[PDB]
Amino acid sequence: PQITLWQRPFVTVKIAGQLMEALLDTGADDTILEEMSLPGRWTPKVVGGIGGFMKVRQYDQILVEICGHKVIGTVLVGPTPANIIGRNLLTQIGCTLNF
Amino acid sequence: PQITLWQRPFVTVKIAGQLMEALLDTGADDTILEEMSLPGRWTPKVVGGIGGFMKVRQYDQILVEICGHKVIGTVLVGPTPANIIGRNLLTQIGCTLNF
Ligand SMILES: CCOP(=O)(COc1ccc(C[C@H](NC(=O)O[C@H]2CO[C@H]3OCC[C@H]32)[C@H](O)CN(CC(C)C)S(=O)(=O)c2ccc(OC)cc2)cc1)OCC
Secondary structure (H helix, E strand, C coil): CCEEECCCCCEEEEEEEEEEEEEECCCCCCECCCCCCCCCEEEEEEEEEEEEEEEEEEEEEEEEEEEEEEEEEEEEEEECCEECCCCCHHHHHCCEECC | CCCCCCCCEEEEEEEEEEEEEEEECCCCCEEEEEECCCCCCCCCEEEEEEEEEEEEEEEEEEEEEEEEEEEEEEEECCCCCCEEEEEEHHHHHEEEEEE
């Protein structure tokens, strides 16, 4: 798809059999998802943004289906105010900015 | 130009005769710039992100030259950890996400 930016660029994503909406976010290095139940081991980590920092659980090698296209990468989970798909996953769906 | 997302999508911007770099940010509703001196009148606002909230000065109808192309819009100034070009200005440069 080509998508304009008059509205927030949400896509449907499926992760561990769960559906949610996530923002395609070229300003985000990392993918961050809202409180969800994901199986396995994780690495404690903190991410920084506007407003300061937030504690997250880091999960590696997680299968994410973004608009049906499958990608695998690191997903951080925590009290984010929006599900964000960051550049680590965007590069795998061949995402480009055109302007 | 078409830009891939293996590195952060920084572009040069010129605002009130000053040059800086700023992240083309599809996840940002608004444009936020680091502490710089703009003239003249403004309205107090707070913006929210990962980690909570940040107090900003809202300046309306500011001319921004992004990769040389001129746009006019609202610029928020304050203690942001990166200059961010948001969708309010990205729409005016004809910016699209392609995946
Ligand atoms: C405190 C010092 O820490 P820092 O790591 C963070 O420097 C940032 C901060 C924010 C952004 C844009 C937002 N990205 C972001 O948080 O990404 C996180 C996760 O990946 C990492 O990549 C860099 C920051 C991490 C995102 O693009 C837009 N919103 C976030 C979310 C709501 C989608 S926002 O900036 O909070 C926002 C913008 C405009 C608004 O007007 C209404 C409202 C809100 C980029 C870089 O410094 C790095 C040198």
